[PDB]
Paper text:
Diabodies are among the smallest of these bispecific antibodies. They are constructed by connecting heavy-chain variable fragments (VH) and light-chain variable fragments (VL) with short “GGGGS” peptide linkers. Therefore, the two VH-linker-VL chains associate to form a dimer with two antigen binding sites, each consisting of the VH and VL fragments from the different chains. In order to investigate the structural flexibility of the Fv interfaces of diabodies, we have determined the crystal structures of 10 mono- and bi-specific diabodies with and without bound antigens.
To generate bispecific diabodies, two non-identical VH-VL chains split by thrombin form a heterodimeric complex. We determined the structures of three monospecific and three bispecific diabodies by substituting the arginine at position 83 with other amino acids. The bispecific diabodies were produced in single chain format by inserting a 42 amino acid linker between the two VH-VL chains. This highly flexible linker is harmful for crystallization and was removed by thrombin cleavage after the protein had been produced. The structures of the bispecific diabodies were determined in complex with bound protein ligands. These are the first crystal structures of bispecific diabodies. The second Fv domains of all the diabodies are clustered in a small area, demonstrating that substitution of the positively charged arginine greatly reduces the structural diversity of diabodies.
Numbering used by the authors:
A (entry chain A): 1 to 367
B (entry chain B): 4 to 271
C (entry chain H): 2 to 127, 133 to 237
D (entry chain D): 2 to 121, 127 to 232
Amino acid sequence: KIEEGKLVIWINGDKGYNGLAEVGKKFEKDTGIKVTVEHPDKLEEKFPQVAATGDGPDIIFWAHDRFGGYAQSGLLAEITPDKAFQDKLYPFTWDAVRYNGKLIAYPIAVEALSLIYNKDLLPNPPKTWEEIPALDKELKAKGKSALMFNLQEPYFTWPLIAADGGYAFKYENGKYDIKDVGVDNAGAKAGLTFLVDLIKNKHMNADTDYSIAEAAFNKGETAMTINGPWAWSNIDTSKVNYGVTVLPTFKGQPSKPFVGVLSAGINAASPNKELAKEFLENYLLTDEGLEAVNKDKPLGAVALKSYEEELAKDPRIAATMENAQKGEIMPNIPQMSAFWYAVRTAVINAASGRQTVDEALKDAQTN
Amino acid sequence: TVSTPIKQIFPDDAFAETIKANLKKKSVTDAVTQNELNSIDQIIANNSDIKSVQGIQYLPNVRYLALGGNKLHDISALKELTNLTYLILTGNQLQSLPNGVFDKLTNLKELVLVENQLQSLPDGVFDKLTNLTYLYLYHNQLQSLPKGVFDKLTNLTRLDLDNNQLQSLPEGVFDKLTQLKQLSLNDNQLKSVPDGVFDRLTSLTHIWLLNNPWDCACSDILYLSRWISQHPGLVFGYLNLDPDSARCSGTNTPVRAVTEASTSPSKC
Amino acid sequence: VQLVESGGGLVQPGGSLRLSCAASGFNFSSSSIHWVRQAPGKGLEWVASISSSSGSTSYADSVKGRFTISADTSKNTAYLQMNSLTAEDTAVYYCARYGHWSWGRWWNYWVALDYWGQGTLVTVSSDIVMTQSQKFMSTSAGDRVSITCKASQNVRTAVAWYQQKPGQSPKALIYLASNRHTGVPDRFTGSGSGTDFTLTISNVQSEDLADYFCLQHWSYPYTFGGGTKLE
Amino acid sequence: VQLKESGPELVKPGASVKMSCKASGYTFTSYVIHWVKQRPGQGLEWIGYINPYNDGSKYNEKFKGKATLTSDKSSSTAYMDLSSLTSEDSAVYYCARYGVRGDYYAVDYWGQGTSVTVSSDIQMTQSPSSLSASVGDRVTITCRASQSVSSAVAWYQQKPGKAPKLLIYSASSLYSGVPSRFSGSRSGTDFTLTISSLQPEDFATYYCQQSSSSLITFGQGTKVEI
């Protein structure tokens, strides 16, 4: 299990784990508590399974949407920051970590999907999605592609799904309405249909994932990709002269991604709870703290009032937030777990030719 | 011969309508010579919602003007109505009297200013109304009074100051009446009347003092007490003679029951 | 695209009033609706907000408990019920859509009230002025000072002066233009009648350093002066 | 003789306060008890008067929806209930008499005073309050938030007698339809509205608004004159 006197932290493999361990050893050199940062695969699914047997990490990092399902089964400890440390973060971000009147996690930064485009190849990016099958043929006279991005994860295909009026659950009368699911409306049916057409007209490939989408933009094989601020560091290195701008509109409506806040939650079963709140409150959510993380892999719009101002100048954060402002923030209801599973199966089945669009979404609504 | 339609003399439609009612007329744009204006001896426009009496300057014979429950602001047109005998201005929201509006109306016998939001009287308003018999000032918001405000109304026999906010009467304010038979002071804010204010009202038969916050702990009340004791057949209330209606304040005991040793001048 | 308000007008202090804002031209069920009022004189003040879907409500502290915002998604109208109104509520009330982030939480972080209603006027109605031509004085013991206080209208000899030194309730120095309230030295004298009044103090002494103001009690409302603090 | 006011209060906004004034030394029921407000910093303000005999009451029309005046002739006390509280009601309150003696009208004695404090923000400061730059000129309006906000600011234009239209959202982005010459920019906590050229329809008032945390707050306004 986990010993006391040690913090075991889990954070997803695309974030800046190396810089978080840097902060961990800062914690070591003056409290004596060893900190181990690990980035296990499918982190978000292993945690409910190992925590209910007793153990796993102390601290888990993820978007805020899965922390609802966690707190509902009581895997998370209720956090008690005083109203003066709450003021060090935007009074915005504390809503995304509040499940059932209680606070269950610390907000670290706000993530949002943006359009990343090769400035050396596509100086004026497309304002709409409509013009990409036409932009593609113009870049098939070079051998280039037009656009590539993770189709394995519905997180990335949803800004086009929810574009023309698609949605997860209807937020009506204080609650998210669990039985009102908008994965069949005219908009989602027309959003995924346009995604399908791009594949069978061979402007993308249904088999593309994260590891060939970024692995094609960093070598200049593709003009555009859709990714979050964590990919900037790898792109910064490759010295591909790129820009970060607002997503293309789809049939007038702007692309509406789902927004998550990177949040740190504390295992309810940890013997090291106060140690874990010292690390987060005193060391991580600080200037010298987040700067360590942000330099490994950028976090987006950080929730710390303080360090946000210093990154303001960044035209890349603006595109992140300007694109978050279109489309709403992720519900955290326990059903998000089964929501994403229902959507990646309807996207995959329709990207692949197994069911058409109408057939793929009608399945997903049967909960 | 100036054939002048009514609605030019009197800009107020409702007011011109009382004229059309006063002369036995058929329409309201009819012509009216000065001759028929001078047939108007009385204008009862009681309860008829009139804003300005502008134009009543040219009715030389109004001996009886009663304008009640109206919206009057400006009665300055009334100071040239010398032949005014009875003036009754009730229910109107006029906050003040012009200095010298009544100066000219030397034939006034009865003046009823009632239910306006009067807070003060001018220093000498009544000074020329020497033939005044009945003066009714009740339901105004008066708090103090001018000195000798009544010193000229030597023929007065009925004075009604009831239901105001009179906090104190000026010294000898009543010294020059000598003919008053009825004086009302009920429903006011008097703590105490001046030493000997009623000493010269040698024609007085009815007086009302009830519903005042008389201050029977101060030694100034002594005068009122020894007066009620002397003249009990003079003090009235609602039913009949009640000389116990002049109650103390906070004890509700009769004023005429206050003894010298039961107060102290150190208080007031 | 438009937002039509209604229900403004004349209301007695303490009374109530219901403003309506009829919406059409946008998805109204996925927008927030905000009320922003503007005094005849001052800037825009945000009053209350609502998300047409979550029913979520928020208010500015200056109306909390007196105002109740609501909305009817089927009739596309939002209403602002305004009870127990004060005179300082008199203002033009505007109604404005947010749209965007609303229909989750964050429904009231970060607005851009793109579209506005034409506004509607609310008037809550059912005065003498004393000017103290000098807020600060300067003097030293065996002193000379005179403090002036001039009315905007004719208060007829009915004005009083008050000595207020810090941490204390005002002393009452002079009543009715010229009378030394009992216990006040011969050193203080009050002067004047009509529009124009003075308080003169002679040998000024260390215990005379305090803030003096005037009060007219002729007409209503009773009104004070600005205060004059002595050096 | 003396008037004794209840002890100090501290209430949250929107809640209730009723304070007391216990008369002693004269005949309470025969003399009126005025009430006066005094905010730290500015002059006195008269509230009402309620005479403990009827007891009727005039209020100053600024207060008539708040202040309620009552009295109990039995216990020689006058009361004042102020609801619902906002933070502008943070003040010292007084009661004082109105004593008369035929020709002596005063307020006489004031109570020691009841202190009231009310609380549990973002202040947008524009520069300048009013400018005056000509057609064609480059106007720059700066607006500085007190507390740290993100790129959350918006800029509105308000021609006299019409509802504000929106120009800039999120601190730098031009709203739909808005002309080219308008622009927004952010340097930490001050936000700059700049119009590159200036056309004759720009001569109106300009508000900035912060929403990082709802309570929503606007600027005092910048007026652009011809």
